[PDB]
Amino acid sequence: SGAIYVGNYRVVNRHLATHNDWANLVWEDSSRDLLVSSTTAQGCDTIARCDCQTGVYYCSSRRKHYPVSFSKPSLIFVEASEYYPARYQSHLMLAVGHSEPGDCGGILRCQHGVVGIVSTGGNGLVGFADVRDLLWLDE
Ligand SMILES: COc1ccc(C(F)(F)F)cc1CC(=O)N1CCC[C@H](C(N)=O)C1
Ligand SMILES: [Zn+2]
């Protein structure tokens, strides 16, 4: 679990979104595994606006933060689940690192701020859904 709170927005994994998130929907994209809902309180997370390929993520299954190198956002296959069919997920970045299903929502950050959130994992790999292109999160 986990979310990004920026301004009057809450960014979560779409597959983990709640009834309130769907009832206060701003935007969602199944192909990115993202959902943004509105909030009644101001968020202060800084979204990074950069092309960094190094950063630190929070890994709930280890109660620890890990430094990682990660790929540029791209399309990558993801197998079925209670949430999605086998398909390509866009705006996804991979890194070598530990992750388990409940790790989705963990923040990845670089020196510029929030980069994205854990969305996939498996094989000693960790996938992050990028949020740096969502310029409207600030305005
Ligand atoms: C961080 O997640 C994982 C990490 C590890 C594993 C391992 F296979 F090893 F058991 C599995 C996962 C879970 C996973 O990748 N997905 C299930 C939920 C929806 C995700 C999506 N964005 O389509 C895909
Ligand atoms: Zn950066």
Side-chain angles (χ1 to χ4, degrees):
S1 59
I4 305 164
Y5 294 91
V6 46
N8 287 325
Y9 296 126
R10 165 174 140 99
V11 189
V12 288
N13 294 93
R14 191 191 184 274
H15 73 273
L16 297 183
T18 71
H19 284 304
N20 188 58
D21 286 321
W22 272 104
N24 289 301
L25 178 66
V26 167
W27 168 84
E28 56 74 27
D29 188 330
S30 196
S31 76
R32 297 177 62 155
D33 182 39
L34 297 178
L35 186 148
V36 180
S37 62
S38 57
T39 68
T40 60
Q42 212 95 56
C44 314
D45 283 321
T46 283
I47 308 295
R49 300 303 182 191
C50 67
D51 70 341
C52 276
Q53 273 182 254
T54 69
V56 176
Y57 76 107
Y58 182 64
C59 170
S60 66
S61 61
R62 289 290 181 272
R63 281 194 207 121
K64 275 175 155 77
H65 296 259
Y66 288 111
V68 282
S69 295
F70 54 91
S71 67
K72 291 205 161 166
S74 64
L75 267 166
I76 289 125
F77 176 79
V78 181
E79 315 243 317
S81 70
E82 307 92 341
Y83 336 91
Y84 303 105
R87 90 219 197 271
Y88 282 69
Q89 177 165 317
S90 62
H91 298 272
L92 187 61
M93 303 172 291
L94 293 187
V96 178
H98 179 72
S99 70
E100 298 175 41
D103 285 325
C104 286
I107 285 167
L108 169 68
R109 296 178 80 93
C110 61
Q111 62 187 115
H112 306 110
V114 175
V115 173
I117 48 166
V118 177
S119 176
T120 77
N123 281 320
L125 305 150
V126 55
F128 309 96
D130 185 52
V131 302
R132 301 176 281 188
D133 63 320
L134 307 177
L135 311 187
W136 55 269
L137 290 179
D138 298 315
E139 53 212 41

